[PDB]
Design a protein around this ligand. Structure first.
Ligand code: HEM
Ligand code: HEM
Lengths: 140, 143
């Protein structure tokens, strides 16, 4: 649906630019937790091709899907639910993930470019953007 | 449509909180540019009654409908398209307006005034309100 995905991309781009994240993404899933939409920013096509397949919603991704609550991490790979990055996936450290809610999905940002953890303010802002995304999906 | 207006009100409420505006509103119009929905935040019911009539889409409101582009102003009443506030309408100075759009159609405008720090709205404020407006566009388009 060209509607929703233009909007979801715009929302991801705004979140990423507003909190100075190097990477940003959003997954939307059905109530069976199968990923329906995956939108992303900050990774070029050549790298996407190397990774080769879309996230299935595992590790910390799957964690946010099954228990949709905001999560900020200094190091996502140190979370005990972490599964690891697949081959050619850029390594990422700092992490901010918030549910797309009215819960249909997750908005997540990584590697704030100052090397610092994401802030409280960052989380409030991105949560509002995810809420906006929730409205867009719910109404699509 | 109370469903659609509840949604639009939530988006306005979010925008107003996020950019620290004293007032926030959204109009939706048809292709004749007749206002179909108007939702707002920061003005109480007694004052609304006193204003006495809903915006028709004139002055700077009408400017955004007629030319749907993002617009920030230090003083809305100084814009050459300004018509002035009606009686009992709170005076407003700083202004941020963005189209509620989807593709080959712009259906409305999200606007914020009087940022509470007394400052003009920022580049960041506009980026943020644009994203919320895009969400509103989907809600409108799908109603
Ligand atoms: C650019 C924004 C992106 C962000 C912020 C992001 C974030 C993450 C994070 C933090 C993990 C670790 C999960 C864990 O260790 O538990 C992960 C895993 C994974 N990522 Fe990404 N990623 C992005 C882009 C992409 C792209 C473009 C692809 C594929 C084309 C991809 C495919 C995968 C896959 C297959 C996994 C394994 C877990 C799963 O399948 O759900 N990612 N991602
Ligand atoms: C609370 C958020 C509100 C904002 C941000 C806002 C903002 C504005 C702005 C920027 C103008 C243009 C001024 C000019 O051209 O000089 C205007 C005019 C106007 N306003 Fe509002 N206003 C709000 C609430 C309301 C309410 C609650 C009413 C009535 C129920 C109302 C009725 C009108 C009318 C009738 C005009 C004359 C232009 C027209 O008819 O479109 N406003 N306002």
């Amino acid at each position: 649906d060209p509607d929703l995905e233009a909007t979801l991309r715009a929302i991801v781009h705004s979140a990423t630019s507003l909190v100075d994240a190097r990477y940003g993404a959003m997954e939307v899933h059905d109530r069976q937790h199968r990923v329906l939409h995956f939108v992303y920013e900050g990774i070029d096509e050549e790298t996407v091709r190397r990774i080769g397949h879309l996230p299935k919603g595992l590790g910390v991704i799957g964690l946010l899907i099954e228990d949709p609550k905001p999560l900020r991490l200094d190091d996502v790979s140190a979370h005990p639910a972490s599964i690891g990055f697949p081959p050619y996936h850029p390594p990422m450290r700092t992490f901010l993930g918030v549910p797309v809610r009215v819960s249909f999905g997750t908005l997540y940002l990584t590697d704030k470019t100052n090397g610092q953890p994401f802030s409280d303010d960052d989380e409030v802002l991105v949560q509002a953007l995810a809420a906006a995304a929730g409205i867009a999906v719910a109404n699509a």
